[PDB]
Amino acid sequence: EFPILEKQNWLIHLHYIRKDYEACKAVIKEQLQETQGLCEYAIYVQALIFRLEGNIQESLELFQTCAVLSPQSADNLKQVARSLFLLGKHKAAIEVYNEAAKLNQKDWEISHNLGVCYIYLKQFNKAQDQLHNALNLNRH
């Protein structure tokens, strides 16, 4: 048929789970060029490859595009704030985690990354209960 089949994400997730990052970059360039543009999962795992290499400044603007195409998803607004925990800008990240903490409740790691990002600040007392909030939902 005419438009796109638009879903071949089952293959790209097989490449990234196999750590074959050189063949996966071809299919990301293939599927994004096969569609007219703005594919979702081809953007996401391309940002998760650059975050494995150290290019965290490039794995933050790609997660900004992935924060646009689905603003009701609690994944990317959580996954952006992981890429801001690593660039050093700590206090900027604790509100984006709160931005995902209100779009979804009862989540384990969002109440845990808020714990560890307070300890790299100097606020300690409101970090100790955050991990207690992160332990009761899921022990790790």
């Binding site: 975050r51 494995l52 150290g54 965290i56 660039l87 050093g88 790691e109 845990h112």
Partner: protein, 73 residues
């Protein structure tokens, strides 16, 4: 040793740009910039402390300390 972090992190910043060999500022950058939390510059710091001197001990206990943070939690 005294506490002047931002003073120290600029002298190592200019010790590296004068000697683009000699691993000792590069590794020493990545134990100031790791204790703060900037795990992106503290990778490229401890990247050059491998290429300019491999078989170091406390670089290989630092890149694998960082590459666990980069994959997932």
């Amino acid at each position: 040793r005294k506490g002047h972090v931002e003073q120290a992190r600029a002298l190592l910043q200019t010790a590296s740009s004068l000697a683009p060999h000699m691993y000792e500022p590069h590794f020493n950058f990545a134990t100031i910039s790791d204790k703060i939390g900037d795990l992106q510059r503290s990778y490229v710091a401890a990247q050059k402390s491998e290429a300019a001197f491999p078989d170091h001990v406390d670089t290989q206990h630092l890149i694998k300390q960082l590459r666990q943070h980069f994959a997932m939690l």
